[PDB]
Design a protein around this motif. Structure first.
Motif, PDB file in Angstrom:
ATOM      1  N   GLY A  66       0.798  -1.213   0.000  1.00 49.33           N
ATOM      2  CA  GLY A  66       0.000   0.000   0.000  1.00 49.33           C
ATOM      3  C   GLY A  66       0.833   1.266   0.000  1.00 49.33           C
ATOM      4  N   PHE A  67       2.074   1.161   0.460  1.00 51.34           N
ATOM      5  CA  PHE A  67       2.926   2.332   0.627  1.00 51.34           C
ATOM      6  C   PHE A  67       3.150   2.996  -0.720  1.00 51.34           C
ATOM      7  CE2 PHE A  67       7.030   4.483   0.716  1.00 51.34           C
ATOM      8  CZ  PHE A  67       6.912   5.257   1.864  1.00 51.34           C
ATOM      9  N   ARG A  68       3.226   2.167  -1.754  1.00 51.93           N
ATOM     10  CA  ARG A  68       3.495   2.622  -3.110  1.00 51.93           C
ATOM     11  C   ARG A  68       2.276   3.309  -3.735  1.00 51.93           C
ATOM     12  NH1 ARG A  68       2.496  -2.886  -6.699  1.00 51.93           N
ATOM     13  NH2 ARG A  68       0.391  -3.144  -5.824  1.00 51.93           N
ATOM     14  N   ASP A  69       1.129   3.208  -3.068  1.00 53.30           N
ATOM     15  CA  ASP A  69      -0.108   3.804  -3.562  1.00 53.30           C
ATOM     16  C   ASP A  69      -0.204   5.264  -3.163  1.00 53.30           C
ATOM     17  OD1 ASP A  69      -0.940   1.434  -4.702  1.00 53.30           O
ATOM     18  OD2 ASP A  69      -2.198   0.854  -2.995  1.00 53.30           O
ATOM     19  N   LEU A  70       0.683   5.682  -2.267  1.00 54.52           N
ATOM     20  CA  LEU A  70       0.708   7.060  -1.794  1.00 54.52           C
ATOM     21  C   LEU A  70       1.394   7.951  -2.817  1.00 54.52           C
ATOM     22  CD1 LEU A  70       1.700   6.450   1.933  1.00 54.52           C
ATOM     23  CD2 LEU A  70      -0.518   7.205   1.071  1.00 54.52           C
ATOM     24  N   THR A  71       1.131   9.252  -2.739  1.00 51.54           N
ATOM     25  CA  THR A  71       1.804  10.196  -3.617  1.00 51.54           C
ATOM     26  C   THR A  71       3.258  10.317  -3.193  1.00 51.54           C
ATOM     27  OG1 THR A  71       1.210  12.101  -2.222  1.00 51.54           O
ATOM     28  CG2 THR A  71      -0.297  11.549  -4.038  1.00 51.54           C
ATOM     29  N   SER A  72       4.120  10.585  -4.163  1.00 56.56           N
ATOM     30  CA  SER A  72       5.528  10.827  -3.899  1.00 56.56           C
ATOM     31  C   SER A  72       5.705  11.688  -2.648  1.00 56.56           C
ATOM     32  CB  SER A  72       6.160  11.505  -5.119  1.00 56.56           C
ATOM     33  OG  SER A  72       7.261  12.316  -4.760  1.00 56.56           O
ATOM     34  N   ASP A  73       4.847  12.692  -2.494  1.00 61.93           N
ATOM     35  CA  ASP A  73       4.997  13.660  -1.411  1.00 61.93           C
ATOM     36  C   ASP A  73       4.708  13.044  -0.048  1.00 61.93           C
ATOM     37  OD1 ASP A  73       3.668  15.274  -3.932  1.00 61.93           O
ATOM     38  OD2 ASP A  73       5.258  16.442  -2.952  1.00 61.93           O
ATOM     39  N   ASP A  74       3.659  12.234   0.022  1.00 61.30           N
ATOM     40  CA  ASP A  74       3.279  11.587   1.267  1.00 61.30           C
ATOM     41  C   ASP A  74       4.286  10.504   1.643  1.00 61.30           C
ATOM     42  OD1 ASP A  74      -0.402  11.640   1.332  1.00 61.30           O
ATOM     43  OD2 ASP A  74       1.117  13.086   1.968  1.00 61.30           O
ATOM     44  N   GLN A  75       4.823   9.823   0.639  1.00 68.18           N
ATOM     45  CA  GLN A  75       5.910   8.886   0.866  1.00 68.18           C
ATOM     46  C   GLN A  75       7.091   9.613   1.496  1.00 68.18           C
ATOM     47  OE1 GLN A  75       5.041   6.071  -3.053  1.00 68.18           O
ATOM     48  NE2 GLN A  75       7.130   6.557  -2.415  1.00 68.18           N
TER      49      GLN A  75
ATOM     50  N   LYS B   1       9.524  18.059  -1.915  1.00 70.12           N
ATOM     51  CA  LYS B   1       9.762  19.526  -1.767  1.00 70.12           C
ATOM     52  C   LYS B   1      11.235  19.811  -1.490  1.00 70.12           C
ATOM     53  CE  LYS B   1       6.670  19.898   1.542  1.00 70.12           C
ATOM     54  NZ  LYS B   1       6.242  20.917   0.544  1.00 70.12           N
ATOM     55  N   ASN B   2      12.064  19.612  -2.513  1.00 73.99           N
ATOM     56  CA  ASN B   2      13.514  19.762  -2.406  1.00 73.99           C
ATOM     57  C   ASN B   2      14.180  18.575  -1.704  1.00 73.99           C
ATOM     58  OD1 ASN B   2      13.905  22.646  -3.458  1.00 73.99           O
ATOM     59  ND2 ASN B   2      12.385  22.969  -1.830  1.00 73.99           N
ATOM     60  N   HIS B   3      13.734  17.361  -2.026  1.00 73.38           N
ATOM     61  CA  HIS B   3      14.339  16.144  -1.487  1.00 73.38           C
ATOM     62  C   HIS B   3      14.807  15.247  -2.626  1.00 73.38           C
ATOM     63  CE1 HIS B   3      11.617  17.403   1.864  1.00 73.38           C
ATOM     64  NE2 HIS B   3      12.711  17.133   2.553  1.00 73.38           N
ATOM     65  N   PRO B   4      15.856  15.676  -3.344  1.00 75.64           N
ATOM     66  CA  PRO B   4      16.430  14.939  -4.475  1.00 75.64           C
ATOM     67  C   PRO B   4      16.734  13.483  -4.153  1.00 75.64           C
ATOM     68  CG  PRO B   4      17.521  17.041  -4.202  1.00 75.64           C
ATOM     69  CD  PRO B   4      16.684  16.840  -2.983  1.00 75.64           C
ATOM     70  N   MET B   5      17.402  13.259  -3.024  1.00 76.13           N
ATOM     71  CA  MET B   5      17.980  11.952  -2.726  1.00 76.13           C
ATOM     72  C   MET B   5      16.948  10.984  -2.168  1.00 76.13           C
ATOM     73  SD  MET B   5      21.666  13.204  -1.178  1.00 76.13           S
ATOM     74  CE  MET B   5      22.766  14.219  -2.197  1.00 76.13           C
ATOM     75  N   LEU B   6      16.046  11.493  -1.334  1.00 77.52           N
ATOM     76  CA  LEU B   6      14.928  10.695  -0.839  1.00 77.52           C
ATOM     77  C   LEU B   6      14.035  10.260  -2.000  1.00 77.52           C
ATOM     78  CD1 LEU B   6      12.858  11.764   2.288  1.00 77.52           C
ATOM     79  CD2 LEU B   6      13.146   9.479   1.304  1.00 77.52           C
ATOM     80  N   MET B   7      13.718  11.203  -2.879  1.00 76.60           N
ATOM     81  CA  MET B   7      12.838  10.922  -4.007  1.00 76.60           C
ATOM     82  C   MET B   7      13.457   9.887  -4.946  1.00 76.60           C
ATOM     83  SD  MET B   7      10.792  13.629  -6.437  1.00 76.60           S
ATOM     84  CE  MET B   7       9.637  14.000  -5.117  1.00 76.60           C
ATOM     85  N   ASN B   8      14.769   9.958  -5.136  1.00 82.16           N
ATOM     86  CA  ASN B   8      15.458   9.022  -6.021  1.00 82.16           C
ATOM     87  C   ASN B   8      15.495   7.619  -5.431  1.00 82.16           C
ATOM     88  OD1 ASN B   8      17.552   8.620  -8.425  1.00 82.16           O
ATOM     89  ND2 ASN B   8      18.420   7.637  -6.600  1.00 82.16           N
ATOM     90  N   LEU B   9      15.671   7.537  -4.116  1.00 83.53           N
ATOM     91  CA  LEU B   9      15.723   6.251  -3.425  1.00 83.53           C
ATOM     92  C   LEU B   9      14.337   5.607  -3.338  1.00 83.53           C
ATOM     93  CD1 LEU B   9      18.218   7.116  -0.534  1.00 83.53           C
ATOM     94  CD2 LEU B   9      18.566   5.453  -2.403  1.00 83.53           C
ATOM     95  N   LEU B  10      13.305   6.430  -3.485  1.00 87.68           N
ATOM     96  CA  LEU B  10      11.933   5.947  -3.422  1.00 87.68           C
ATOM     97  C   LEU B  10      11.409   5.477  -4.772  1.00 87.68           C
ATOM     98  CD1 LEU B  10      10.085   8.339  -0.945  1.00 87.68           C
ATOM     99  CD2 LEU B  10      10.448   5.860  -0.741  1.00 87.68           C
ATOM    100  N   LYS B  11      11.954   6.019  -5.857  1.00 88.06           N
ATOM    101  CA  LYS B  11      11.451   5.695  -7.188  1.00 88.06           C
ATOM    102  C   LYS B  11      11.641   4.218  -7.530  1.00 88.06           C
ATOM    103  CE  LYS B  11      13.988   6.651 -10.906  1.00 88.06           C
ATOM    104  NZ  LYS B  11      12.551   6.414 -11.214  1.00 88.06           N
TER     105      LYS B  11
END
Ligand SMILES: C=C1/C(=C\C=C2/CCC[C@]3(C)[C@@H]([C@H](C)CCCC(C)(C)O)CC[C@@H]23)C[C@@H](O)C[C@@H]1O
Lengths: 240, 11
Positions: A66-75, B1-11
């Motif tokens: 379910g975690f992946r169902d959240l928006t990038s921002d909420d993650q 919101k300005n989190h390059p590295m977190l966002m990349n590790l999450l993708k």
């Protein structure tokens, strides 16, 4: 009864932890060396440890159903606020009540109160941190309950900055009911007595530990010379 | 919101 879906969920979280926690601690050699002489002599090493662990906590959260169902921002908000709490939680696996230290396989990588102190923190955080480790250890959780608690910690509706709190809460409820039901069907008494409520109390302890850590972190990091010894990921996740 | 590295590790 533990439905097939709830068993599937436990299976996924067990594997996710398996893939993100190395009980051999082999990677610690990559970190800047620990110095136990000297102010902040343990900061470079423990900053690295933490940075490495944030990366692992992130890989774990990605595999939470379910975690992946959240928006990038909420993650992003969920991980920024939960990361230190999940690191305190996951570190229980290396903590030992034998001498109240975190024992990572060798003397070099065994950390006690004075190591954490030489990383720029005070007893105001450290004492209740150990009491937390002790009380968590005393629950003697099943590994199934350990990974469920970490996952529930990560997907918390009341975290600052959350947008879709309704959906965060829905994902957590699935994990919470998975945990409540697991305990009833799989944790025999007396260990099960109030175990859910004790585990949720630990999530409250973690909020308090989070608040204090952030305070001592802001004081530590506000000094450019200290903030210089941190890592880029720690600065981004914990604040800069 | 300005989190390059977190966002990349999450993708
Ligand atoms: C990390 C992990 C481990 C131990 C955790 C510790 C021991 C040393 C002090 C730490 C790192 C506490 C400190 C309050 C955090 C200081 C961080 C900073 C200086 C940046 O503000 C939090 C958890 C504690 C070892 C292993 O269990 C992997 C786990 O994943």
């Amino acid at each position: 009864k533990l439905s097939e879906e709830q068993q599937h969920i436990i299976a996924i979280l067990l594997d996710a932890h398996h893939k993100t926690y190395d009980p051999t601690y082999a990677d610690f050699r990559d970190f800047r060396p620990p110095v136990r002489m000297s102010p902040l002599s343990m900061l470079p090493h423990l900053a690295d440890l933490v940075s490495y662990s944030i990366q692992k906590v992130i890989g774990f959260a990605k595999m939470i159903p379910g975690f992946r169902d959240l928006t990038s921002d909420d993650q992003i908000v969920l991980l920024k606020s939960s990361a230190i709490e999940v690191i305190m939680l996951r570190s229980n696996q290396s903590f030992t009540m034998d001498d109240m230290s975190w024992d990572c396989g060798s003397q070099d990588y065994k950390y006690d109160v004075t190591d954490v102190s030489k990383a720029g923190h005070t007893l105001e955080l450290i004492e209740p941190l150990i009491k937390f480790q002790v009380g968590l250890k005393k629950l003697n959780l099943h590994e199934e309950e350990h990974v469920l608690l970490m996952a529930i910690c990560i997907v918390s509706p009341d975290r600052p900055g959350v947008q879709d709190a309704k959906l965060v809460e829905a994902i957590q409820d699935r994990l919470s009911n998975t945990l409540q039901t697991y305990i009833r069907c799989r944790h025999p008494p007396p260990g099960s007595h109030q175990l859910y409520a004790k585990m949720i109390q630990k999530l409250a302890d973690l909020r308090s530990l989070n608040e204090e850590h952030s305070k001592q972190y802001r004081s530590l990091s506000f000094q450019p010379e200290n903030s210089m010894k941190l890592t880029p990921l720690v600065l981004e996740v914990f604040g800069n | 919101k300005n989190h390059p590295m977190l966002m990349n590790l999450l993708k």
